[PDB]
Design a binder for this molecule. Structure first.
Ligand code: HEM
Ligand SMILES: COc1ccc(C(=O)O)cc1
Ligand SMILES: [Cl-]
Ligand SMILES: [Mg+2]
Length: 393
C-alpha cells in the first residue's frame, strides 16, 4: 500500500532542482518508502506536521539524521536537546529558551540593527557585491560570534563546522563522508570554545554556563548547550538571509512592497523561510509500530520529513510557489513544530528582520548581475554565490 520511490533526496541533481521531485513525493501518497536509503518519507503538510507533533512515537533520541544512534555511534556526542526526548529534553531546552528569550533580544537589538544598517550602506558604496559572501555570511559573522561571546581567534572554523553538522544529518554519501573525515580540527576548536573560560561574560555562552547555578543543567551539560548554538546559530541564518535576498532579487514587486512598508520586514523574512526552507529535512525514528497515513511502519524505522515540501504543499498553501510578504505564514514548518520547534527563532528573526529593514529603507533595486552558484549540503538549501547589483534608493 506504500509506494516505493527511487528518488534520492540527497543527490546533487535533487538539490539542484527539488521541486519536481517534491511534488512526486507529495503526490505519490501521504507516506512513501525511499528504496535508495531504506526510509519512510512524508512530504505533505498534514503528515509532516503530525509527525513533528507526535514525539512519543516519532522520537529524536535515536538521532534526527539517517543514522540510528541505537545501531551506529554518532559522529560526536549527542545533543542534549536536538537529539533528546522528553523528559530529558525539557530542562536543557528551557535553559536555551531563557538564554535566547524575548528579554535577551532587547539587549542585542540595537547592535544587530546597527550592524545591518552599516552593512547595507557599506555594500551600496561598492555596487557590485556577492550577496552570499558579502552579505548573507558577512552580516551574521559580524553579529553572532560576538553575541555568543566568542574570542576572535579561530572564528574561521565556525562555518566549516556548521557545514559538517548539517551534512552529517544526511546519508553516508560523498558530502557526508568528505565533511566528517579530517573534521577533527573543526571539532577541537568548537569544543574548546564551549568551555566557560573562553566565553565572554554577558554573552550567550556565558549565560548558558550561568544557568548551571539553577539546577536546570549541570556544569558538564553547559558545554553541549553552547555547542548547540555553535552548530545551528550561524549557518542557519546565513541561508535564511541568503534566501531572503534571493527572493527579493527574483520578485521585484515584493521588494517594492517591502520598500513602501519596511514594517513588513519581519514577515518578509518569515515568508522567505517558508518559501526556500533553508533547513530542508530532519529525520525521526519510530519507537513503536504505528499507522501513519494509512500505512503500517514498524518499530525502529527512520522517517524523513520534507519540511521544504511541506511548506509548498498546495493542499495547505494557496500559490505555494509565490513569494508573498503579506502571506499568513503561521503554521509553516521551516522552524519545526511541537516540542523541538527552533529555540533560536527569535535570534534568526531578529537578524532577518533588521537586515531586511535595512534593505527596505536603503535599496531601490536588487538585480542578479553574475553567475549564480548553488551550495550543496545534505540538509541546508542555499547559494554559494549570488552576484547582485544594489541600486540605492
Ligand atoms: C532561519 C534560521 C533557522 C532555521 C530555518 C532553523 C530551523 C530549525 C528547525 C527546523 C528545527 C527543528 C529540529 C527538529 O525538529 O528536529 C530547529 C531547532 C533548533 N534550532 Fe533552529 N533554525 C534557525 C536558526 C537558529 C538559530 C539562530 C539558533 C541559535 C541561536 C538555532 C538553534 C536551534 C536549536 C538548539 C534547535 C534544537 C531545539 C530543540 O530540539 O528543542 N536555530 N531549528
Ligand atoms: C536546525 O538545525 C540544528 C542543527 C544542530 C542543532 C544542535 O546541535 O543542537 C540544532 C538544530
Ligand atoms: Cl564538536
Ligand atoms: Mg569524538
Amino acid at each position: 500500500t506504500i509506494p516505493h520511490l527511487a528518488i534520492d533526496p540527497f543527490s546533487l541533481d535533487f538539490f539542484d532542482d527539488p521541486y519536481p521531485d517534491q511534488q512526486t513525493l507529495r503526490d505519490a501518497g501521504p507516506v512513501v518508502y525511499l528504496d535508495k536509503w531504506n526510509v519512510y518519507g512524508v512530504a505533505r503538510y498534514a503528515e509532516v506536521h503530525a509527525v513533528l507533533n507526535d514525539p512519543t512515537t516519532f522520537c529524536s533520541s535515536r538521532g534526527v539524521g539517517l543514522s540510528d544512534f541505537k545501531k551506529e555511534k554518532p559522529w560526536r556526542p549527542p545533543s542534549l536537546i536536538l537529539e533528546a526526548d522528553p523528559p530529558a529534553h525539557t530542562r536543557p531546552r528551557a535553559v536555551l529558551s531563557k538564554v535566547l528569550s524575548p528579554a535577551t533580544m532587547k539587549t542585542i537589538r540595537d547592535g544587530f540593527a546597527a550592524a545591518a544598517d552599516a552593512k547595507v550602506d557599506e555594500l551600496l558604496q561598492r555596487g557590485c557585491i556577492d550577496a552570499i559572501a558579502d552579505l548573507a555570511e558577512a552580516y551574521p559573522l559580524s553579529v553572532f560570534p560576538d553575541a555568543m561571546g566568542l574570542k576572535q581567534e579561530g572564528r574561521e572554523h565556525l562555518l566549516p563546522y556548521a557545514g559538517l553538522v548539517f551534512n552529517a544529518f544526511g546519508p553516508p554519501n560523498e558530502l557526508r563522508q568528505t565533511a566528517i573525515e579530517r573534521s577533527a580540527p573543526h571539532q577541537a576548536y568548537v569544543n574548546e570554545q564551549c568551555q566557560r573560560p573562553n566565553l565572554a561574560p554577558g554573552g550567550f555562552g556565558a549565560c548558558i554556563h550561568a544557568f548551571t547555578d539553577t539546577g536546570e543543567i549541570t556544569p558538564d551539560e553547559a558545554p553541549l548547550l553552547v555547542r548547540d548554538l555553535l552548530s545551528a546559530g550561524l549557518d542557519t541564518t546565513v541561508n535564511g538571509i541568503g534566501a531572503a535576498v534571493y527572493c527579493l532579487a527574483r520578485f521585484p514587486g515584493e521588494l517594492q512592497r517591502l520598500r513602501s512598508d519596511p514594517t513588513l520586514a519581519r514577515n518578509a523574512f518569515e515568508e522567505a523561510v517558508r518559501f526556500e526552507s533553508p533547513v530542508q529535512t530532519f529525520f525521526r525514528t519510530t519507537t513503536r509500530e504505528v499507522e501513519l497515513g494509512g500505512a503500517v511502519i514498524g518499530e525502529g524505522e527512520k522517517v524523513l520529513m520534507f519540511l521544504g515540501s511541506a511548506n509548498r504543499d498546495p493542499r495547505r498553501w494557496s500559490d505555494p510557489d509565490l513569494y508573498d510578504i503579506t502571506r499568513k505564514t503561521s503554521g509553516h514548518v521551516g522552524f519545526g513544530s511541537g516540542v523541538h520547534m527552533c529555540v533560536g527563532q527569535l535570534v534568526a528573526r531578529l537578524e532577518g528582520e533588521v537586515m531586511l529593514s535595512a534593505l527596505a529603507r536603503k535599496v531601490a533595486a536588487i538585480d542578479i548581475d553574475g553567475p549564480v552558484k548553488r551550495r550543496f549540503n545534505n540538509t541546508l538549501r542555499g547559494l554559494e554565490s549570488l552576484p547582485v547589483k544594489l541600486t540605492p534608493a
